[PDB]
Amino acid sequence: RTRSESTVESFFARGACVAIIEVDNDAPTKRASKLFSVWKITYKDTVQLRRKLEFFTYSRFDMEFTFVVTSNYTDANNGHALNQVYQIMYIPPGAPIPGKWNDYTWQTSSNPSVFYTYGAPPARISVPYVGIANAYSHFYDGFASLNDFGSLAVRVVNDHNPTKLTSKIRVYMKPKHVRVWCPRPPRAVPYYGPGVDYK
Amino acid sequence: RTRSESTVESFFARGACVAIIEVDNDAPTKRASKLFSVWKITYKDTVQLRRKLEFFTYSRFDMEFTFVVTSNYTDANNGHALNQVYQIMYIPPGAPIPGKWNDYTWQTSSNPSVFYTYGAPPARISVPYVGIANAYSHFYDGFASLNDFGSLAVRVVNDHNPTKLTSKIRVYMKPKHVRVWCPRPPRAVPYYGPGVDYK
Amino acid sequence: NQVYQIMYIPPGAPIPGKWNDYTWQTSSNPSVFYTYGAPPARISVPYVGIANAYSHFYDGF
Amino acid sequence: RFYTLDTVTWRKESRGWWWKLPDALKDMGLFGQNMFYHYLGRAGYTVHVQCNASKFHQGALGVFAVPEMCLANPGEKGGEFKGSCPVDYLFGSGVLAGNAFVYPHQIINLRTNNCATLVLPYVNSLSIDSMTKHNNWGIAILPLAPLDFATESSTEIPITLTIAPMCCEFNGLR
Amino acid sequence: LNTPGSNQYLTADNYQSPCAIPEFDVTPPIDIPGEVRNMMELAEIDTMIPLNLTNQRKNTMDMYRVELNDAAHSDTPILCLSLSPASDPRLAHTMLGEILNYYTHWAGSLKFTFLFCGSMMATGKLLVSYAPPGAEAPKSRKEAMLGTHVIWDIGLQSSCTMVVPWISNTTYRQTIGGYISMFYQTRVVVPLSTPRKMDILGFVSACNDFSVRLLRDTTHISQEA
Amino acid sequence: LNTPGSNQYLTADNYQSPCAIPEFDVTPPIDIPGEVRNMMELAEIDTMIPLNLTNQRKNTMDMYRVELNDAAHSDTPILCLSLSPASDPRLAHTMLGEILNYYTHWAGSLKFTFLFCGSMMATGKLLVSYAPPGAEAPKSRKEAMLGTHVIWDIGLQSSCTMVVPWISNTTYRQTIGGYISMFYQTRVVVPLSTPRKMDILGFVSACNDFSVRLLRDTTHISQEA
C-alpha cells in the first residue's frame, strides 16, 4: 500500500474530453442550422472514465467543466465576421430542457450560465454534488444508473449575420474530491448499451 | 425554518436578463438607424422577478448591472471594420433623458458612464439604493410603483464608417443586499398592464 | 482564430498515429491548449527517468 | 431468530446458485411480515452456509456477498447459473470469476471445513430505504471445484443456507 | 490561454463591482414591521385549502368548504387529501405549494388543521385517518380504523390539528407520501330546526423542520420565450 | 507576451473554479461500508489465477484449476508461472494485473497462494520452486531442487503461501522477474475408491510494499478514436 499517484484522487481526478457540441449561427442555406444540441452529463460516453467508476458501487465527487470553443468559416470568402459570443448554460437536475433557441429556458432565471467570448481563455465552471441520495449509485438492483448530473446547453447569442459559421465546443470534465465505496471487479467484456448486458 | 438556499438573499439575488437594447453605427440606407433606445430600469418587464418582488410590500436592495454586447455585420461582404466602442451611461432619477445622439446629456457632467470595448469582458456596474423613501413601495393605495431606479442609455461613439453594423446589448440585473417587509400572497392571475388590474 | 493542442506523451505511452485516434483523448497524457495571440505556452516536466540519474554513456547491453 | 431457506443439492454438473436479499426473506414469517408492513426499513444480515458432506467427498464452494448484485425475483429458491440464467464464469455481469473474490467471501473446502459464516452490514446510498423494491445484498455460491465422491454411495450433497437479520429498523407503518 | 470561466459573465458569479454613484447619501433604513429573513416564514403560515375542487366549485368561494351533513350520508371518504403539496391541485395553490413550486426538492414535516363552522348545539363524531406512504387511501370506515387515526368530536371541540411526520428514504424528495381522509363516525345530531348544512374548513402549513434546496423557476405566469 | 501555459487549458492543471450553484445544500455523507483511500487496496486482495489456459479451458470455469493426479504423471512442470503480472496472460486478467495495466511502472513484493481441493484421506508431497530472475525455469525435479524450493505436503496442510521478494536493479520497472513452477515429489496416494482427479487452485496478490507511479490508460475496452 502507501505511496502517492495510486490514491483514489490521483486515480480519478484526470481531465478528459467527454462531449462535443456542434452549434451554428444563421443562414441555414441547405442545413438544419442547429443552434444548440444539449448534452446530458454522464460518464457512459467515455470508456476509460466509465471503467474507472465501475470499479466501485458508490462514489462522491465534484465535477469541473472546461469548455474549448473552436470556430470555422464554412466558406473561405464570405468576409470578416464580428467576434462570436457563446452562452453555456448548466441545467440543474429536474429543470426543463430547452427545445427552442429563444424559449424561456434561456432566460437563466434559475439555471446557471456563463458567456464565453472567442479568443478568451477557455471557460471553466465547477458543479458540486447535485445528487439526491447520499452517494452516486453505479449499480441498482431493484425498481439508479441515471445519477442526475444535470445537463449542458450551448448556443450562439449573436445577431443575424449573413456569413455562415460553425463552432465546436469540447467539454472536459475533471472529477474532484473523489470518494469511493464498495469495490467491484473490473469489467471483462465490451460494453453493449448503458446497462450491464453482455453477449 | 432554518437551512440555506431558502433565505431572502438566496431567493432574490439571481442573475436574469431584464432588457435588450438595439443600437446602430451609421449608414441608415433604408432604416431609421437608431443610435440609442434608452431603457427605464424596472422589474415589470420580467415575470419571474416581478412575481418574486410582489411577494412583499416594501423592499430594499442594490442593483448590479451586467452588459453583454454582440455585434453583427448586416452585409457579409462590406469589409473589415475597426473595433467598436460602446458608451453605457446610467441616468440617475430626476435627470433629463437623452433625445439626440449628440446632445448635452451625453457629456457625462453628472451622469455615470462606462465605455465598453468589443472583445473585452462584459461591463459591470453597481447601482446603490437610489430611492427617495426609506424603502421601495411595490404597492401604494392613494394619490409609488414607479420607484425611480433611473434609466440606462447605450450609444456608439465610433466615427462615421461606411460599413453597416448592428449590435445587441443584453442587460442582466442581479439584486444585492435584499431586505423585504410586509409579506403578501402570490399573484394568481396573469398580469395585464403595470397595475393590479385583473380580468 | 486558431487553437493548437500541445500534448506531452509520458515515457512508455503509445505514440499518436492518426489525428483523431484514441491517444488524443488525454486520458492520461498531459495536454495544453494554446490560443493564437496569447502568451506562449509553458509547461514543466519533472524527472521522468527510470534510474536514479540520466545516463549519457552506457557500456553494455 | 434464524431463518433457514430451502436446501439446495450439489451435483457434479451444478454451475452454482444465487440468492437476493431481502428478496429471499420476503415470505420468511415475522421478518417478511414486518418488511411488507413497513414502507422503509434497515437491517443487517448474517449468512451461514452448511455443506453436509462426508470425509470421502471432494470439491470446494465459493460463497460471495455481492452488494447490489445486478444481473444482465425467484424468492426463497433463488436461481442457478448457466454453463454457456446468469453465466457462472461471467458472474452475471460480464466479469471473470477470478476477480469475484474482491467482494467479502468465504471458501468452503471439504477437506478443511464444512461450514462458513459471513457478516453483511447494511450497504446502500441512503440511511433508510424500502425493504421490498430494492435488493440490498446478494448471495452467490459457486462450485470452485467440481464435486466428486467415492464410487460407494450418494450422488447429491445437500446445502443449507441460513440467514439471520440483525440491527432491524422499521418506519412508515402501512 | 482562454478557458471557460475567465473573462466571461457567470449567472452565479460573486465579486465586487465598481460603484456607479460613489459617496451617495443612501437613506437609512427604518424599523418597518414585518421584516422577514427567510422564505420559510411564508410556508409556516396557515392557508385555506381549496379542498372541494368541482366544476361548480372552481375559482370561487364555495370550493374552500365541504358540507358536513347530507340526508343519509355515506360510508365513503367525504374528502381525501394527498401528501403531495407541489403536485396535488388541492395543495398546489396554497402558500406551501407556491413556495415549493420554486424549489425542486423539499423535506420536513407538514401540519394540517381542520375546523368546522356550525352551531354550538350540533353534536357528533368524525374519524380522521392518515394513510402511510405507499398505502391506498381507505375506502370505508373500517379500513380507516385499521390504520393510524384519531376521533374528532363535534361539540365543545371545534378544531383538529394533525402533523404528518417526515417519512422518506432520501433526505430530500422532488417536488414532482400518504393520504389524509375523513369519515363519519356515528352521525350528526342537531336540535329543533337547527341548520343541517354546516360547513368545514381545511388549512395546511409547514413545520419548523421544513427545508428546501436547488431553487428553480415557477410555473405560474410564464410568457417570456 | 503570449507563452505556453498562459491563457490555455492544461490537462494536469489545478486552480480554483467559480461555483455554478453557490450555497447549495450538499447532502452530508454517511458511513458507507467499504471506504477505500488508495487503489493499492484492490491489489492486496487475493484473486484466482486463470492458470491452465488451454483451447478447451479458455473463457470458462475449468481453466482456474489444474488436475493434480494423472495415471503415471511425469517429471515435467505441471504448471509454470512467470513473474510478469502485467504481461503474463495467466496474471494479466487478475486484479493485480488489471491494476498494473493502469501504471507504467511498478515495485514491491508479490504473494502467491496455492490450495488444493481433494479428500482428507489423500496423502502425497509436492515440490514448489522459485526460479531467480534471469534463470530458465526448471525442466525436471532435480533442477527445481538445485534452487530455492519448498516441500508441500498433501494431508493436514492444504494451503501453501509463498512470497516473491522485490529483486530489481532499478527502483521501478516497466509493466511491459523469475518463474514459479510446481513438481511432483513422490506420488499421490489415495485409499479405496477415493477419487483420483482432485484439483488445485492458485491465487495471486500484492504485498504491503507494493507501489506504482506514472498512471497511464488501460488496454481493455478501447473504441474511441
Author numbering:
A (entry chain A), B (entry chain A): 70 to 212, 232 to 287
C (entry chain A): 152 to 212
D (entry chain B): 62 to 133, 148 to 159, 174 to 263
E (entry chain C), F (entry chain C): 5 to 180, 187 to 235
What did the study's authors say about this model?
Poliovirus (PV) belongs to the Enterovirus genus of the Picornaviridae family. The PV genome, approximately 7.5 kb in length, is a single-stranded, positive-sense RNA enclosed within a capsid protein shell. The P1 is further cleaved by a viral protease to produce the capsid subunit proteins VP0, VP1, and VP3. In this study, we investigate the production, antigenicity, thermostability, immunogenicity, and structures of VLPs derived from PV serotype 2 (PV2) wildtype strain and thermally stabilized mutant (wtVLP and sVLP, respectively).
Our cryo-EM analysis revealed that the PV2 sVLP closely resembles the native mature virion in the capsid region, whereas the PV2 wtVLP adopts an expanded conformation similar to the EC or 135S particle. However, the wtVLP appears to be in an expanded state compared to the sVLP, as evidenced by the radius of the wtVLP being 170 Å and that of the sVLP being 163 Å. Structural comparison revealed that the two-fold axis channel, formed by VP2 and VP3, is markedly opened in the wtVLP, whereas it is closed in the sVLP. Detailed structural analysis shows that in the wtVLP, the pocket factor binding site is preoccupied by the side chains of Y159, F237, and N235, and the hydrophobic pocket collapsed, with its volume reducing from 914 Å3 to 577 Å3 (measured by ProteinsPlus). As a result, the wtVLP VP1 “pocket” can no longer accommodate lipids. The structural comparison showed that the wtVLP is highly similar to the PV1 135S-like particles, and the sVLP structure aligns well with the native PV2 model. Moreover, the B-factor of the sVLP is generally lower than that of the wtVLP. Collectively, the increase in the number of ordered parts of capsid proteins and lower B-factor suggest that the sVLP is more structurally stable than the wtVLP. The D-antigen content (reflected by the binding activity to the mAb 1050) in the wtVLP dropped drastically at 35 °C and was almost completely lost at 40 °C, whereas the sVLP exhibited significantly improved D-antigenic thermostability, maintaining >50% D-antigen content even at 45 °C. Next, we treated wtVLP and sVLP at 37 °C for different periods of time and then evaluated total antigen and D-antigen content. Despite the yeast-derived wtVLP also possessing a reasonable amount of D-antigen, it fails to trigger a neutralizing antibody response in vivo, likely due to its poor thermostability especially at 37 °C, the normal physiological temperature of mice and humans.
